[PDB]
């Protein structure tokens, strides 16, 4: 019944170490996308205040 | 205090320089390690005549500079260029007077007696450190894993090394040194891009293969059927936009480059790859310490970095190593700064005070003294 | 070494299915903000260029 | 109580030490038999500099330290390293006083006068015990069966012995030695297996090939057709997995290890073996007592453990005993502590409290007075 737990438990580890590492990559492509975002909204606002007054 | 927020932590590579205050958490200054010297003579506007640049400025003028890299292979090189990438990083970057902070510094698996007798030479007689310490590069990556017995396979940006270590002490006679890293594999992405039917003409086409490489690059478990899969042609194909709008694809050698790292002859390299490199270290070490090191093979490195490099080693070691052994591969997300972020805990450690090499232990012992 | 490793697997698999979890939240708030972000980066180019334009 | 709980016992050996309360039924400590002292300066994490290592500490860091074995052959050949084993085995593996407990110790078969001497000197003035007592070890092997007369053929890791016993006096000039133990076998196993194909190439594979010997090792009868047998290759081998997969596999071997101890040509000793070494220790005695050890050939100690010992040397004096006489092999379960038992007995006993050499016998008689 033991190898069966044992093989049961390194599959299971494996995969949550695969999750877990799929993850430190989506969440931080993310402070990076959302970081990006941010900084484009601030960059689109001064650009459309400055089309503002040279109109 | 005094220390505690005092201590500075800059580890010295190959391609980037990683540097910042013992405690942080991770580098407040990476930067390259270059210096540029003006092939002619003239300004930037605003500025007076520069005898050199150092890191970005380098890089971002090198086209009227001759750049030079003072680290080949993670050796100190050149000791003028050096202590000008220092300069740069203690006055510069973390804009710290020296002479009032504790150094640990970081040095390669087999530097050279002589060079850790250098560099705390030039540190203690020209910077004027209170104190200072070298550690070595995989022993601060494992430790700050937590362990202390494990084997670390370290791959930056000019060397991949192995370094086996026991309750701290790195094994000298089991570490490999494998001269193909990041750098080599930039080049080779490089014309696998070309030879897709590509032109990395001018600077800025040059520049963004490495970015390439980074952000779509790949290590394939099976490496095998993953070109067959290429071939059935999946959604598994990649367009980067370019700094225009030149949308290049790169479907399939996204993962002929880190296969690279595991066939050397992909590059006519008749060297072995990373993970019979991994397996022969610990062929070449004690018998009854080989479970440990199987069971913590501790990644850490730049070129460590390509998605499931880890599944691959994974199953490259377990099938080399005896079936009644446990393998076990770690690779943390921040290793990039494995190397740094160890010395980070270790120099902020309420117990290394005692080990730092202080000018008193200098003016008095000579460069042997923190040579150990 | 059974009860050992049967408790080990299931602290594993309950670790797994957590993190699992946190991330349909993480690549869901995703799809969301690269979204957003692209959606302002165009009505930027476009403002960008109609200030060209005025100017 | 005082001491009926109190009395310690000690059994010193060439490779065990073995230890514990008279009364318990078994030691309640057993250890190697080593003094490592460490090769070069450094510490493990969180501990202080450490002079000497002991027991399995020195065991488990043996490749930084110089090991040392302080009794050679059954004889204590090094006392400052010997009062270091000692000085472990009450302060940290039985954690008692030993200034508040009686100490029984054993000592070998010829030990010199001198020594039971000296072994008191360090007992009485250097760990200053309350009383103490040296008993031979086959004379309490013999007597932890019941009996008072019987041989005992005794035989641990450095040395093997004939002890012939009359109502509990030792015969000292009808004692046999025979320096080829368990240590001896162990090494010849390694060979014979190397020579099977193998390799016990790192320290995890040299140590297990001991538990080899332990685990699968047998003393067939009829050693001539069991090796005849192997040929016709039965279901007579046996495969043992490694601290991996390694499935090593021993047949034959097995067998032809403890052969050694009936054949020292095996191992180019020129010495006679264990059976006819029992018998010439009989017919160097008293011949009216010769039917006595016959009929009480009491065996004890690590090495006579290995399965169908007491069979062959049962039919091996037998065959050159006269027929006349009544042979008898005893072999007890427990034989591996044969020795300590008879010493948990004997002092915990109602009349041994009148034997206990006490601080006032001896600061008022010198050493001799224990010495007998």
């Known amino acids: ?55 | 205090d005094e220390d505690e927020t005092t201590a500075l932590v800059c580890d010295n590579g190959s391609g980037l320089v990683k540097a910042g205050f013992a405690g942080d958490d991770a580098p407040r200054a990476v930067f390259p390690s270059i210096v540029g010297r003006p092939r002619h003579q003239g300004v930037m506007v605003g500025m007076g005549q520069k005898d050199s640049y150092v890191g970005d400025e380098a890089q971002s003028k090198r086209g009227i500079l001759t750049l030079k890299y003072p680290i080949e292979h993670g050796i100190i090189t050149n000791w003028d260029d050096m202590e000008k990438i220092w300069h740069h990083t203690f006055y510069n970057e973390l804009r710290v007077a020296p002479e009032e902070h504790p150094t640990l510094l970081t040095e390669a698996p087999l530097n050279p007696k002589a060079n850790r007798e250098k560099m705390t030479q030039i540190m203690f007689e020209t910077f004027n450190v209170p104190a200072m310490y070298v550690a070595i590069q995989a022993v601060l990556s494992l430790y700050a894993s937590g362990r202390t017995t494990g084997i670390v396979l370290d791959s930056g940006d000019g060397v991949t090394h192995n370094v086996p270590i026991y309750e701290g002490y790195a094994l000298p006679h089991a570490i490999m040194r494998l001269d193909l890293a990041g750098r080599d594999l930039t080049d080779y992405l490089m014309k696998i891009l070309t030879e897709r039917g590509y032109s990395f003409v001018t600077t800025a086409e040059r520049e963004i293969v490495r970015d390439i490489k980074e952000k779509l690059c790949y290590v394939a478990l099976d490496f095998e059927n993953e070109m067959a899969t290429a071939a059935s042609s999946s959604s598994l194909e990649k367009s980067y936009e370019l700094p225009d709008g030149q949308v290049i694809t790169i479907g399939n050698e996204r993962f002929r480059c880190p296969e690279t790292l595991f066939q050397p002859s992909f590059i006519g390299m008749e060297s072995a790859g990373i993970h019979e490199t991994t397996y022969n270290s610990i062929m070449k070490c004690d018998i009854d310490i080989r479970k440990d090191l199987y069971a913590n093979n501790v990644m850490s490195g730049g070129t460590t970095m390509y998605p499931g490099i880890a599944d691959r080693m994974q199953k490259e070691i377990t099938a080399l190593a005896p079936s009644t052994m446990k393998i076990k591969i770690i690779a943390p997300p921040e290793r990039k700064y494995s190397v740094w972020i160890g010395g980070s805990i270790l120099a902020s450690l309420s117990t290394f005070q005692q080990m730092w090499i202080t000018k008193q232990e200098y003016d008095e012992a000579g460069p042997s003294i923190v040579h150990r």
Chains 1, 3 share one sequence.
Do not use: H, M, P, W
């Open chain 1, 1 to 55: 019944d033991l190898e069966r737990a044992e093989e049961r438990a390194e599959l299971s580890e494996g995969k949550c170490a695969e999750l877990e590492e799929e993850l430190k990559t989506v969440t931080n492509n993310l402070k990076s996308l959302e970081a990006q975002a941010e900084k484009y909204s601030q960059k689109e606002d001064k650009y459309e205040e400055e089309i503002k007054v040279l109109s």
